Assembly symmetry: D2
Homo-oligomer: 331 residues x 4
C-alpha cells in the first residue's frame, strides 16, 4: 500500500509519451481539488445547510441551487489558478469566461459544475461534467474558442458523487476510472481502460414524456418491453442525474436516452458541457452517442448553451435505435 497509483501519477506517465508543457496535469490536478471540495460539501450539505435555491436562474432557465454556486465558484477558481486555461464555459455563466492574461494556458474548458439538480435534496447521485479543448486559433481568446465540435476534445470526463466519489477520465487512447480515497484525499486508479459492452439489457429514459416522444423512441421502448424474438425484456433504470445514468451505462452497458420530443426539437441536455463530454467518454469506451440523426461529437455548436438530443451507450443498442429512426425518416 506504499505505491499509490494516483490520477496525477497516471496522467504524468501517459503524457510522458508525447511530453508537452505539462499543463494538462496542472489542469487535472486543479480540477481534482475542486472535485474533492465539492464531494466534501455534498457529503454534508444538509448539515451545512447547502440545500435550497440561490435565488437566480441560468441561461437555460434552471432554478440555481446553492451547490450550483459553490461548485461553480470552486471550479472557476481552481481552473484559473492552474495557468492552463484561457476560455471557460460554465452552465451557470451566461457568457464564456476569459482568463486574465497572466494566468492563461492553452486549454478551453466547458463544464457543468453540478449535474443532477433535481436529485440534490433527495441525496441521489450527482456529479460534475467537463470537456477540455486545446485552443487552436491565434487571436485573442473568446467564446468562439469554445464552439468546437466534440471531435476536437482532448480530454473529457466527469466526477460522480454517489455511494463513492469517482472521477472518470477519457483521453485520446481510452477511459480510466479513479476513486477518491477520503482518508488521503487522492483519486486512485480502480478501473483501467474501460470498455462498454457491445449490447446491454437496461434502457434508461424518462417515460414521463411518453406523450411527446417521436414514433422512433415510442417504438424502441415498446420493443424493449415486448421483444419480438421473445427474448428477456430489458430492465429499466432512470436515476435522474445524467452522470449517474451514464456511468451505469458505461459499467453495466445498455442505453441512456434524452431524445428530442414534440416540444423540444433539440432535447434538453446541453451540448457543450453535458452531451459532448459524455459522448466522448462513451466513444473512447467503444460506445456510441447519437442525436438519432447524427453523431453528437460531429455537431458544430453555434451557442455555448446549445441543447442537443442524446442517445448513447452500447453500440448494438444505439444502432438498433438508429435503424428505427432511419425506418421512420420522412421527406
Amino acid at each position: 500500500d506504499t505505491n499509490i497509483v494516483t490520477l496525477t501519477r497516471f496522467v504524468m506517465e501517459e503524457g510522458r509519451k508525447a511530453r508537452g508543457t505539462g499543463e494538462m496535469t496542472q489542469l487535472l490536478n486543479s480540477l481534482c481539488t475542486a472535485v474533492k471540495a465539492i464531494s466534501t460539501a455534498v457529503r454534508k450539505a444538509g448539515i451545512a445547510h447547502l440545500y435550497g435555491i440561490a435565488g437566480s436562474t441560468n441561461v437555460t432557465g434552471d432554478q440555481v441551487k446553492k451547490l450550483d454556486v459553490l461548485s461553480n465558484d470552486l471550479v472557476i477558481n481552481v481552473l484559473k489558478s492552474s495557468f492552463a486555461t484561457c476560455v471557460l464555459v460554465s452552465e451557470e455563466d451566461k457568457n464564456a469566461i476569459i482568463v486574465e492574461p497572466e494566468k492563461r494556458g492553452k486549454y478551453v474548458v466547458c463544464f457543468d459544475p453540478l449535474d443532477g439538480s433535481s436529485n440534490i435534496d433527495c441525496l441521489v447521485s450527482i456529479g460534475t461534467i467537463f470537456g477540455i479543448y486545446r485552443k487552436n486559433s491565434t487571436d485573442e481568446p473568446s467564446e468562439k474558442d469554445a464552439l468546437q465540435p466534440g471531435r476536437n476534445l482532448v480530454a473529457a470526463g466527469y466526477a460522480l458523487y454517489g455511494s463513492a466519489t469517482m472521477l472518470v477520465l477519457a483521453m485520446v487512447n481510452g477511459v480510466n476510472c479513479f476513486m477518491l480515497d477520503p482518508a488521503i484525499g487522492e483519486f486512485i486508479l480502480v478501473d483501467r481502460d474501460v470498455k462498454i459492452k457491445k449490447k446491454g439489457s437496461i434502457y434508461s429514459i424518462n417515460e414521463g414524456y411518453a406523450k411527446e416522444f417521436d414514433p422512433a423512441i415510442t417504438e424502441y421502448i415498446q420493443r424493449k418491453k415486448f421483444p419480438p424474438d421473445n427474448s428477456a425484456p430489458y430492465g429499466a433504470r432512470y436515476v435522474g442525474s445524467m452522470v449517474a445514468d451514464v456511468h451505469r451505462t458505461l459499467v453495466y452497458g445498455g442505453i441512456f436516452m434524452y431524445p428530442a420530443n414534440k416540444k423540444s426539437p433539440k432535447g434538453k441536455l446541453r451540448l457543450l458541457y453535458e452531451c459532448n463530454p459524455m459522448a466522448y467518454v462513451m466513444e473512447k469506451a467503444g460506445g456510441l452517442a447519437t442525436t438519432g440523426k447524427e453523431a453528437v461529437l460531429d455537431i458544430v455548436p453555434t451557442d455555448i448553451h446549445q441543447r442537443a438530443p442524446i442517445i448513447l451507450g452500447s453500440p448494438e443498442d444505439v444502432t438498433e435505435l438508429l435503424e428505427i429512426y432511419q425506418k421512420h425518416a420522412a421527406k
Copy 2:
C-alpha cells in the same frame, strides 16, 4: 456549533417521556456504529476491492456480494453487543438468529444489511433497512417472534448511502432524518417531523416488467403519462435501490411501486426487512403503503423471508391506484 443535536441525544430526550430500560438507545447507538462502518467501506469499496460476489446465494436466490457479507456481519455483531436484542432476522441468513442469553435484550430486529445490490458496482445509492419489534411472548426467543405484522413495529428506518449518508428513523410519534457528519462520526438531526406531500408528480416503477403488469398497474401508468384532465404528466424516476426511491418519495412526494405481476404473485421485495420498515416510515410520515388489496403493515407473516407487493407514497397517489385495483377487482 457547540450544541450538536445527535441521534443519540434526540432519542434519549424523546424516550425521556416514557422512560424505559434505555436499551432502545443502546440498540440505535449500536446500529449507528454499524452504519458508519458500512458507509466508510462503501465510500471506498473500489479501492478496498469490496466489489464482486461472495460466492453464495441467499434464501431469496440473490447472488451474495462481498458488501452483503461485510454489512451483515457488522450489523449482526453490533446488535448482539447492544444487550438489547434477542431475535434477529437478516436477508442474508436462512434462519432467524437467536441472541445468546447473556447478551439478550427485549427487541427483535429484522434487517436488510445492504439494499440495492444491482447498483453496488455502478456507485448508485444503496442502503440498510431495519425494523424493530418488542418481544411480546414469554417463552424462549425464536423465529416466531419475528413473525409479527408491521403494525407492531416500535421503530423502523433506513440508512441511505447516497451523495450523503442519512439515517431516517420513524417511531410511534413521527419521522426524523439524521445526516452523518463524516468529520466527527455522528448522525445529526437535519430534518424534523417529516411529512410526505398529499400528492406528488413522480411515479417510480421498473417499466421493464410491462409485459407482466396486471391491468391495474398498466392503466395507472398510462394515466400518469396521458392524464385524462390534460394536467401535466408525472415525471418518472427509478434509481433501482428501494432505499433511494423510497427516500425520494418521502421528500419529494409521489409514488413508488413494486407490485405483483403475472409471474410474481407476491411481488419481489421482502416483507420483514424491506416492505414493513418502509411502510412504517411511510405511514408515520402521513403516507400510505398497500399491496394493492390490503395495508402492508396488517399482513401477518408466516415466513421471515416472505415477499410482498408494495405500493407506497403520497396518500392521494396511492389511493388513485387502489381505486383502479378496486375497479378491476374480479370474482
Copy 3:
C-alpha cells in the same frame, strides 16, 4: 474487521457486572462526542482560525484561548444532555455549574476542557482531562459535591490529541486506552489493562524553575544526571502539556514532576481537574502520585480551583523522590 470493540461496548460489558442505571455509559458516550468534536477542530484549527485568545482570563489567571471556549462549550453541552450529571466543575468556569433538574444525573464531573494551552499554537500535543464523582449527599446539588478527595473517583481519564487521538480511561478495576478511528468516528480498544513499569529512565519537569526548586527536587534531578552508582543517567523529556507528559510516563514509565517551589507553595496544576484525574489513572495503573508529603488522591479540597503539587509515575522513581523529601523534612 466486523467486530469493532468500541469504548461503548467495552464500558457496557464491564458494567454488565454490577449492572447500574446505565448512565455512566451515557456519560462517556456524551463525552466521546465532545472529544471527537474537539479533535476535529484542533486537527484544523489553523485553517479554521481557531488559534488566538478569547479575550478573557480564568479564575487561575490564564489567558483564555478560543479553543478553551469551544472545547469548554462542547463538553458542558454534551454532559448536560447526557442525563447523567448534576454538578460540573470546569477550569474555565469560576463556579460549579448546576445541571437543571430535568437533565440531572447522579454524577459530578470535574474537567479541564483543553489542557496544554502554551502548546496550542506550536501544534504540540494537547488534550482534555476529566474526573467523575458519584454524588453521595441527598440535599440540593452544589459546589460542595465537587469537593471530594480523589479517592472517591469512580472514573477518570483524558483525551490526548497527539499524532493520534487517544482516550485513556481508568475505573475501579484498571486502565484502558482507546484510539479514535477517524474514518468511523469511534474509539477502539488498542491497549488493555495498562500497567506502568515499576521503574523508568526518563524524568519530566520544567528545569527553567531551578532557581525556585526546593532542596529535594534539586537533589533528585542532580541524581538523575549524575547517578551515584554510575548507572546510565535518566533521559529528559518535557513536552509542556500535562496530558502528553503523563501519557508518555504511563506507557514508557518514569517520572513527571510539577512540584511546589519557593514562589508556589501549592505548585501550579489544578487538583480537581488536572492532578486528581492523573493521580487516579496513575494509581489504577500501579503507579504513584504524591505532592511530596502526601498522596494526591487523599487531599480533601476546599476550593474547586485549588492547586496542588504533583509528582507521579513509576512507583520506584516516585518513592526515591519521597525518600529525599523525607531526608530533608524539617521541624
Copy 4:
C-alpha cells in the same frame, strides 16, 4: 471558501517568476501525497497495529520501527514517480538511491522519512524532514551528488504530525506554513513569510546528558536558569522529536540544542536529512544554526549519514551561546 490557497497553487505562482521546467511543483505535489499517507497511518497506527519494530537496524544504529519502513517506502515511491529526482538519500537506506533513467529529474532529495522515533508509541509529535538539492554536475548521478553543503539547498522543510498536520516549506525567498485540511486532503497556507523572533524565552535540550556537556553548554544552561541580570529565567521545553522542538522554536522563538558532548564529538542528529533542512528553514526565517564553531549550512559533507552538532533558533539566543563557546575556545 471557494478560493482555497493550496501549497500547489502557492508554489506554482511563486515559481511563475523564474518559470522553470516545473518539476519542483511535481516534486512537492508528490511529496504532499506521501505526507498525507503518513499522516493518515500515524493518526490510526494503534488501530492498524503500526507500532513496534521492523526487525532491523539502520546505518546510524537505530531500531527500525514499522512506520519507518512504511513512511520510507511511501516517500521513495512518490519521489521516483515525480519525474523530478535522480538521487535520493534516506536515513533508512545505507546508500544513496539512484533513480532509474526513465523517471529521472534534476533534483537530489535527502530525507528523514519519520523523525522522532522514541515518541512514536507515546503519541507524541513526529514528522518528516526533507532537503532538496539541484544536481549540478554532468556525469552519471551518484551519492556524491548528495554531498553538497546546506548553502546549496533550493528547498527544505518538514511535515509535522502533531495536534494538526503541518507542512513547513522554505525556499530562496522565505518560509511558509501549510496546514493539512483532512476533509479535502490539501495543504492550505495558514502562515505566510514566517520570521523567528530575535530573542526567545525557551531553551530546548536533553539535560539528561549534563554529565557529558562541554563547559560551554553547561554554562549557557546555568545562565538560562540563573540570569546574571536578574531577568526572568527561560522556560524549558523538550518534546523529544526534532521536528516538534524546532517548529516550536520557529513560532515561539528561543533555542533548540543537540550539541556535541564528551562521547559524541559530532552530536547525534544527521546533517544531510535532519540538521541541514532545519538550519535552512531557520536561516530563511531570520534565525541562526551553528555547530557551536561553524554555520551548519557551510559544512561540506563527506558521508551521507554524517552527524553534526546543531544549535539553532533566535539569532540573539544562538549568538549568546556562540560567544560562550568562543570564550572557552582553547588552543
